[PDB]
Amino acid sequence: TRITLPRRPAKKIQLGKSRPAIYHQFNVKMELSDGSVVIRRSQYPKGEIRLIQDQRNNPLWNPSRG
Amino acid sequence: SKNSVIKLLSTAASGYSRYISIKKGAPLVTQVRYDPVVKRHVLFKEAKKRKVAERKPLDFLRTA
Amino acid sequence: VVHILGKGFKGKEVIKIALASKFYGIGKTTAEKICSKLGFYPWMRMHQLSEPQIMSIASELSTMTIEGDARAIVKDNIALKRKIGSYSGMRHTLHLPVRGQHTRNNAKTARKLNKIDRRG
Amino acid sequence: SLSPLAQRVVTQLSVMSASRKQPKLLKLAREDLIKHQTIEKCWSIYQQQQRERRNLQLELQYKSIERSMNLLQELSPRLFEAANASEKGKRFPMEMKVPTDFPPNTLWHYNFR
Amino acid sequence: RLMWTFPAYFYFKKGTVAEHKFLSLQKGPISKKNGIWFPRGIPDIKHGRERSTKQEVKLVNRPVIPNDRITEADRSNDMKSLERQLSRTLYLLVKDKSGTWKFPNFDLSDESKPLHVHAENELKLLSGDQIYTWSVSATPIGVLQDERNRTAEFIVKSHILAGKFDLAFEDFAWLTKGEISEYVPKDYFNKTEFLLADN
Amino acid sequence: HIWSDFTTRPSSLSIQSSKVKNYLFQKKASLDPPSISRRSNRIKYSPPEHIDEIFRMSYDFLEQRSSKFYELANKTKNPLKKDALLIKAEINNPEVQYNFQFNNKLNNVKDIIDYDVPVYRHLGKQHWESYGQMLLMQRLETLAAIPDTLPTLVPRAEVNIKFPFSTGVNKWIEPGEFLSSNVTSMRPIFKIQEYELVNVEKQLYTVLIVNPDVPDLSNDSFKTALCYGLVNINLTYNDNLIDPRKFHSSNIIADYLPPVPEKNAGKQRFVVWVFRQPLIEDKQGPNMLEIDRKELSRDDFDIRQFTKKYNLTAIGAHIWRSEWDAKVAAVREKYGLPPGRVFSRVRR
Amino acid sequence: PKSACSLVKPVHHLVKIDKSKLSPRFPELKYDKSDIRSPGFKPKDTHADRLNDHYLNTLQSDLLLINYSHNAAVVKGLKQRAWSGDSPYHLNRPPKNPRGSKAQLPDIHPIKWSNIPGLESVVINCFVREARENQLLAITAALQLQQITGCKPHPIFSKNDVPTWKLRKGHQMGAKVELKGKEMSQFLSTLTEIVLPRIREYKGISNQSGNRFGGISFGLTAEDIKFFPEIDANQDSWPKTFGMHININTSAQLDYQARTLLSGFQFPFFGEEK
RNA sequence: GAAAGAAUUAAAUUAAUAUAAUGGUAUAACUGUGCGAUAAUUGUAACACAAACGAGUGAAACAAGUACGUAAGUAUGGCA
RNA sequence: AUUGAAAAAAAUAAUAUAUAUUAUAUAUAUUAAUUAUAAAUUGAAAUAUGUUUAAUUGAAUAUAUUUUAGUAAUAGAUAAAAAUAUGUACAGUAAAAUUGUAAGGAAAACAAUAAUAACUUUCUC
Numbered sequence A: 001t002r003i004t005l006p007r008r009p010a011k012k013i014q015l016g017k018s019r020p021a022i023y024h025q026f027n028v029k030m031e032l033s034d035g036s037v038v039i040r041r042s043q044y045p046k047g048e049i050r051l052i053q054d055q056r057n058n059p060l061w062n063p064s065r066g
Numbered sequence B: 001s002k003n004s005v006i007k008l009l010s011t012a013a014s015g016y017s018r019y020i021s022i023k024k025g026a027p028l029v030t031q032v033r034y035d036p037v038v039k040r041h042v043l044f045k046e047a048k049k050r051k052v053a054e055r056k057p058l059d060f061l062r063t064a
Numbered sequence C: 001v002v003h004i005l006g007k008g009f010k011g012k013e014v015i016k017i018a019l020a021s022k023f024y025g026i027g028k029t030t031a032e033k034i035c036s037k038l039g040f041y042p043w044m045r046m047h048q049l050s051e052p053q054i055m056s057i058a059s060e061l062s063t064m065t066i067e068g069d070a071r072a073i074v075k076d077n078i079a080l081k082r083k084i085g086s087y088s089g090m091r092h093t094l095h096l097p098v099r100g101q102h103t104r105n106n107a108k109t110a111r112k113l114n115k116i117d118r119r120g
Numbered sequence D: 001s002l003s004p005l006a007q008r009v010v011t012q013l014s015v016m017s018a019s020r021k022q023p024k025l026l027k028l029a030r031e032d033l034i035k036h037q038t039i040e041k042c043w044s045i046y047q048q049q050q051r052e053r054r055n056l057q058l059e060l061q062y063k064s065i066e067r068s069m070n071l072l073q074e075l076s077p078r079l080f081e082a083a084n085a086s087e088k089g090k091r092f093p094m095e096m097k098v099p100t101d102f103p104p105n106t107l108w109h110y111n112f113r
Numbered sequence E: 001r002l003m004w005t006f007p008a009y010f011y012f013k014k015g016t017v018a019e020h021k022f023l024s025l026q027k028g029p030i031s032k033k034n035g036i037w038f039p040r041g042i043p044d045i046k047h048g049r050e051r052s053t054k055q056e057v058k059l060v061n062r063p064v065i066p067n068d069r070i071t072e073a074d075r076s077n078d079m080k081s082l083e084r085q086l087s088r089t090l091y092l093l094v095k096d097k098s099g100t101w102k103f104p105n106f107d108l109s110d111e112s113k114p115l116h117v118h119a120e121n122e123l124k125l126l127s128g129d130q131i132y133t134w135s136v137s138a139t140p141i142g143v144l145q146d147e148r149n150r151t152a153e154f155i156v157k158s159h160i161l162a163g164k165f166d167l168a169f170e171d172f173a174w175l176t177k178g179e180i181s182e183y184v185p186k187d188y189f190n191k192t193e194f195l196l197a198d199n
Numbered sequence F: 001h002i003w004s005d006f007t008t009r010p011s012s013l014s015i016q017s018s019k020v021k022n023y024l025f026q027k028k029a030s031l032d033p034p035s036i037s038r039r040s041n042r043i044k045y046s047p048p049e050h051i052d053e054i055f056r057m058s059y060d061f062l063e064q065r066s067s068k069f070y071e072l073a074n075k076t077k078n079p080l081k082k083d084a085l086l087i088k089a090e091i092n093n094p095e096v097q098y099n100f101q102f103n104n105k106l107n108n109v110k111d112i113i114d115y116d117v118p119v120y121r122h123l124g125k126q127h128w129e130s131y132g133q134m135l136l137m138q139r140l141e142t143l144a145a146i147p148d149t150l151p152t153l154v155p156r157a158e159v160n161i162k163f164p165f166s167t168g169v170n171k172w173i174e175p176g177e178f179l180s181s182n183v184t185s186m187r188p189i190f191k192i193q194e195y196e197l198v199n200v201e202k203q204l205y206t207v208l209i210v211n212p213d214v215p216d217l218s219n220d221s222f223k224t225a226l227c228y229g230l231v232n233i234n235l236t237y238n239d240n241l242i243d244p245r246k247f248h249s250s251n252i253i254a255d256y257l258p259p260v261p262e263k264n265a266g267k268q269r270f271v272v273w274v275f276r277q278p279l280i281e282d283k284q285g286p287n288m289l290e291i292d293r294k295e296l297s298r299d300d301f302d303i304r305q306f307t308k309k310y311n312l313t314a315i316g317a318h319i320w321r322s323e324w325d326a327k328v329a330a331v332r333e334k335y336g337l338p339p340g341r342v343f344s345r346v347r348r
Numbered sequence G: 001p002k003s004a005c006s007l008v009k010p011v012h013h014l015v016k017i018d019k020s021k022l023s024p025r026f027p028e029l030k031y032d033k034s035d036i037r038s039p040g041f042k043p044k045d046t047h048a049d050r051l052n053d054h055y056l057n058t059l060q061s062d063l064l065l066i067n068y069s070h071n072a073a074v075v076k077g078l079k080q081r082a083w084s085g086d087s088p089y090h091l092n093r094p095p096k097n098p099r100g101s102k103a104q105l106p107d108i109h110p111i112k113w114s115n116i117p118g119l120e121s122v123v124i125n126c127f128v129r130e131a132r133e134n135q136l137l138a139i140t141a142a143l144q145l146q147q148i149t150g151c152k153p154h155p156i157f158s159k160n161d162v163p164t165w166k167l168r169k170g171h172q173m174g175a176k177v178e179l180k181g182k183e184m185s186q187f188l189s190t191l192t193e194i195v196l197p198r199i200r201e202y203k204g205i206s207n208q209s210g211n212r213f214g215g216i217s218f219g220l221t222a223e224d225i226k227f228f229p230e231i232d233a234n235q236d237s238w239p240k241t242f243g244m245h246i247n248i249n250t251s252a253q254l255d256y257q258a259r260t261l262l263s264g265f266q267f268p269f270f271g272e273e274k
Numbered sequence H: 001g002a003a004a005g006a007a008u009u010a011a012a013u014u015a016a017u018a019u020a021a022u023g024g025u026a027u028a029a030c031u032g033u034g035c036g037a038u039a040a041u042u043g044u045a046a047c048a049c050a051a052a053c054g055a056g057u058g059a060a061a062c063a064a065g066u067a068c069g070u071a072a073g074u075a076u077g078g079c080a
Numbered sequence I: 001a002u003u004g005a006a007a008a009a010a011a012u013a014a015u016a017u018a019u020a021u022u023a024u025a026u027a028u029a030u031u032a033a034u035u036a037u038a039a040a041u042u043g044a045a046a047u048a049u050g051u052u053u054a055a056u057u058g059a060a061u062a063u064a065u066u067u068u069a070g071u072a073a074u075a076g077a078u079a080a081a082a083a084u085a086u087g088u089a090c091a092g093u094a095a096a097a098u099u100g101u102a103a104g105g106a107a108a109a110c111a112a113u114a115a116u117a118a119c120u121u122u123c124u125c
Helices: C015-022 C029-038 C052-063 C068-083 C087-094 C108-113 D004-016 D030-075 D077-083 E017-025 E072-076 E115-127 E177-183 E186-191 F018-024 F039-044 F051-075 F079-090 F094-101 F118-130 F132-143 F303-310 F328-335 G050-067 G135-149 G182-198 G229-233 G255-264
Strands: A026-031 A037-042 A048-050 B003-005 B008-010 B021-023 B030-035 B040-045 E091-095 E133-135 E142-146 E151-155 E158-160 E171-175 F157-162 F189-194 F204-210 F214-216 F221-223 F226-234 F252-254 F268-276 F313-322 G119-125 G154-157 G172-176 G215-220 G244-250
Touching: A037 G182, B008 B030, C015 C029, C029 C052, C068 C087, D004 G135, D030 D077, D030 E142, D030 E151, D030 F018, D030 F051, D030 F094, D030 G050, D077 E115, E091 E177, E115 E133, E115 E158, E142 E186, E171 E177, F018 F094, F051 F079, F079 F118, F094 F118, F118 F132, F132 F157, F132 F268, F132 F313, F157 F268, F157 F313, F189 F204, F189 F268, F189 F313, F204 F303, G050 G182, G050 G255, G119 G135, G119 G172, G119 G182, G135 G154, G135 G172, G135 G182, G135 G229, G215 G255, G244 G255
Parallel strands: A026 A048
Antiparallel strands: A026 A037, B003 B021, B008 B040, B030 B040, E091 E171, E133 E158, E142 E151, F157 F189, F204 F226, F204 F268, F214 F221, F226 F252, F268 F313, G119 G244, G154 G172, G215 G244
C-alpha cells in the first residue's frame, strides 16, 4: 500500500573521514525588472537570467515610485 | 514452544558442547567461547542440522 | 508542445487554434492574428516552433489580457449588479437561469455551473 | 523492477547524494600547508579588527546618544519626552533596498508619490 | 577543487537537443588506457570527471550586460549629484555665509512640534518640496555644543529616499566620510566622526 | 620589513633550509615543493591556485603587525611583559611556524628550534599542553601517584626519562610503562624542559625518584622509598639533559638503587618528581642548599615533609612501574642487595 | 556486569585532561573542521555576503538609534519563585514554578552597541503529508529544498502516531534545512526580490506572527515555490511542488525588534501589531 | 569594549529505562556513537545475606583464555 | 629512477625496509589511498590509427581499444523518529508546557523559551 524505495545496506562513513557536501554551483547573473544586475550562486546551469516580475517593479516594494 | 535448545559443538575435535537456547528460526549460530579440554578459546558451530528462515542476501553491490 | 506559458500543448498541433484551446484569455480571431504579428507560417504545428520563437509567443500573451485573469473581471461584473439589487444576482447566486431561460424545467445547466465564481 | 516515477525519484536522490560525485581529498605539502595557515590566520585577525572597529563605532554612537538625551532632559522636558517614545511598530522604508551587485538603468528617482 | 561533479544526467535528459549543445560546449577527461605512462598519476574518473582535479563546466533571448559601477557624475566629480558614488554612503553637507561647511542647522524657536519632524519640515522648505526624506528615529544621534554662543545643536538622523535638494546657505554637497574631513573643520569632524558610516 | 632583519633578532626565527625559504617567498607559483622529494610525485602535485599573491599580502600584514609590536616590546622594562610582547610579534611568522611544526621538539637542534627564544618556548609549551601534559596528568591520577606521594601537581616543566646505560636501546619512557628489571638495572637520564620564563643562571633544581609501594609488614601497609635523589642541578632551556656528565657526586643525596620488586608484593610505582629551588634575592650566583644526609632515610621517606623542610615546589613529574620478574634476583646480586622476599599469592 | 552503580571519582589536579587527544584512534578527527588537514574542511568565507554587508553599513546603526530608550534598565522575566521560609516543610522544597508560565522566561535587556538585533538562522521546515502514502514524495521535497538553498537538507520523520490522519510513527515525511551565514542571507535576498513579489495577493508577513522572543515565521504554498529560479529553470522536474514553513531566528530580545530588523531587509509587514 | 572558549549555578530522575510496582538513575543505569559480538567463558570459590531442610541472593579472591580501552582499566549477561 | 617547471637531511604519524634488547626500539627512505568492489546492444567521453582544410594543425569522421554512466540517501563520534536489549570506550541531555508558523485544526512537523561571577584566549580604545 505504502509506496517506497527499499533501502540497500548503508555505506559506513568512518569517523574523521566524513566530508562536507559541497554541491556544484555556478555564478549566475540575475538582471531584475530594471537593469540592476545581481550575482548569485546557483545549482542550475544558467549563467544569465533576466526577471520580469520582481520587487523592483512591484507596487508594494516601491509605493513612492497570453 | 517459541524457544528451543541446540548443541553448539567445538571446532577442536574435543566433544565439548555448550548447549544454548535459541528461537525457532535461529540464524545458524556460531559462537567463539572457551574449550576447557583444549585449554583455548575456539568457535562453536551447531551440531544437529536444523533450518533457517529464507534470509535474503544483503545487496552490498548495486544490481538489477 | 513543451511547457509554453506553463500549460503548454503537443506537437503536430497547428498553433493557430492550439492557443484558442489551452489559453482562456485568447481564442478564435485573437489567437489567429496573435500568430500573425509573430509572423509564423499558418497551418504550422507546435513541434516546428523554434523555442526562441515561443519566447515571443509568451510575451505576446502577456501584452493582452489572458488566463483566469479575465475570469475574475467577469466574476466582478457578475458580483457587481449581484451586489446591487439585480434579478441576475439572485438568478446567479441561487444557481438559476441568469439568461431568464427555462427555470421551470431545463435549468439543471444553470444550477450545474451558474454560481458566484461561475467559470470554475 | 522499477517504474519511470521510481527511476526519476532515484535520479533526484542521486542529485543530493555524495555517491560517486566527490573528488579526492585536498592534500597539501608542508610548505603549502603553512602558507595556507598564514593566509587563514591573517584573514581571521583582519575580520576581528573589522568587528572591533564596527563595535567601537557603535559604542561611540550609543555614548553620543546618551549624552544628547541627558542634555535634552536637562533643557526641554517636552522635547525629551518626544524623543524618548516607544518605536515598537517602526518599519524601515521600502525604498531603502539591499544594495545590488550592479546598479539599475535609472540610478536615482527625482520624483515620487 | 573540492566541489562535487556536476550531475548533468539530471539537468540534461539523454537523447535531447539541449543536452547535445552542453556536451559540445564541454570537453571530456583523459581516461586510463593500458600500456601507457601517465606521469600525473592514473586517471581516477567517475561520472566523467578527473577526481584528482578541479572540474570546469562551460555553459527575451538577450545577453545580460551589467551597467558600469562608476558613473558620469563620478567621472566629472559633481559633488551636488546623488549618483556620483554608488558603493558608498553619501551625507548632505552645507556651506553657510562664512567659509565653513557643516551639517544643516535650524533654529527651533517654537518648541511645540517634535524635533525630528521640525527638522524634516525645514529640509522640505529648503528644497521647495523636491526632497523625500525618512527619519530613522525621534531620538537625536548627538549634540554640538559651545560656550561662545550659548547654544545646543541636537543632531537628528534621516534618510534621503527619492528627490533633489538644490536649495541661509550658499552652497551644498553630497560627500563620503573621507571627503567630509577635507571639507569640514578638524574639531567639528572629531565631534561628528563616529556618527558617519565608513562605507 | 622586520622579519627579514636579523641584526637584533635571533637566527632561529629564519628557516635554515634555503630551498624551502625560496619556495615560500616567490613571485609566481613556478617552483615545486622541497617536501615532495620524488620527481614523479612533484610532477603529479598541483598546489591550489592564486595562493602566492594572497600569501604575500598576508605576510606583509602580519609582518607589519610584528613590527608594530616590536615598537612596544623595546620600550617595555619588566621581563615577563617583554617576553609576551616578543611572542606576540613573532608567533604568526610563517618561518618560525615551519621550524617548530616540522622538526623535533624533544631533541631540538638549537639552530632550528631555540628554546632560548621566547616564541619557540611558548610554542613548545602549547604543544606540551595539547597532548603530553594531559597524558602525564592522567597517568598520575589513575595510578594514584599524586595523593599517595605528593598532594597535587601543577605541571610546568615537561619531564622525560630514559634508561640508556642498562641495555643499549634508545627509548623515551611513556608515563605509566611496565619496564623490566634489566631495563631499569642502571640509572635513568632525565630531560627537564622548562617553558616558563625563569632565571637560568640562578635557578637550581632537585630530582627525586620515589617508590611508594614497598611493603612494611609491621604496619601491615606500605612505605615510601627514595630510590634516586639529586639536588642543586643547573638547567638551561637547550642544555637540559640530566646525565652523569652534568651533575657531580656532591649533587647525589641518594644514589640510584634499582627497582627490585618482590614476588607477589605487586606492581610498584616509581614516580620521579622534579622540584625547582627557592630563589633568594640580594645574592649573585646559584644559591645552594645543604641536606642533612643522616636525617633523610631511604628505606622510609616522607616526601612531603622533605619538600616542606627545603621549601621546594614540584614543577614536573614522570612515572614508570615495575613488578617482579626472573632477573630481579640477578639485579639484587649485582647491586649486593639481599636475596629478596617472597610473599603469598593470596592477599588474605 | 557486577553492578550498575555510576560514581565518578574525584581527582587531585586542576589540569583538564582531554581524553580524545590521548588516544591514537581518530587522527583525522583531532583536527578542527576549520583546519585544511581535516577531511571535513570546507571553504567558508568564499565571497562577500551582500545582505550582511548592508546590515553592517546602513541598518545596524539605525536599529541601535531606534532601540535607544533613555536610562532603560533590565526587565527580568518570569522565573521560578522560591518559598518563603514560614514553615519547616519549605526547607528542601523545590521552588514554585513561574507565575503565568510553567517554563521560565528570559530577561529582556536594553539594546546597546553589543546586543543589536540581527539575523541568526533560517530554518525551512517542509513536512509533506501525502508522503504518509508515498515515501518518494519526501525525497522530491528534500531535493526541492536543496535546490532552493544550495544546502544539504535533513530528513523529517513522523515522530507521533494518530489514526484520524493516516499517519504512522517512524516514517520519512518531507525535510528541513537550517541555513546559517551567507547561504541563509542569499536565501533571504532571493525571497525578498524574486519569490515574494511574484505571489499575487501578498500583503506581507503578519505582525501577529512570531515567538515572544526574537523569532518570526511564515509559509509558502506549492504555487509559490515555482517562482524560485532553480525550480523555474526546470519546472518540468517540479510538477508536484511542496509548500514549506520558514522559521527566521533573530538575535532580537523581543519580537517587534525582530520585525523591524526584517523590514530593514525589505520584508513587508501588514497585520495589526500586538 | 568585543568575540570565543572553557564552562558554573540553577532546574530536572515529571522524559526515559526490554515489561508490572516499588526502589535507583543526569556522577547518569537514560541517550548517541566507534569498535566489537567477546565475559550470554572455564576450573577451585572464602565469606557473608537469607535460611528448617532442599533451595535461593551478593561475592573478595586463585587460575585459563577472550573482548574493548592511550591508559586507569571494565566485562563471569541485561539498573535491581 | 625516465618528462614538466627552473651537495642532502632534520618534527608527528603512516607505510617501506632493515637491525638492537630475557626494553613494542631505533636507522635510512617516501609521503599512497581516504565513499570504493562484478554484472550495462544502446548513454557519454579519452586515447591510437583512417578523409578534407593552412609535410603540416584544426575539423569532421570511421575501427579497435578502453574509460566512464548500474546514477540511492548517514558526510555526523550523529544524540529522545524507527531500527539489536550482552561487552567496552567516548560524548550529550530529556519531557512537559506557552508565543508561534502553507494547508494546520484539540490532536502532523518545525522554531524559540534560566543565570553569566569568575577564569582563559584574541582583537582593540
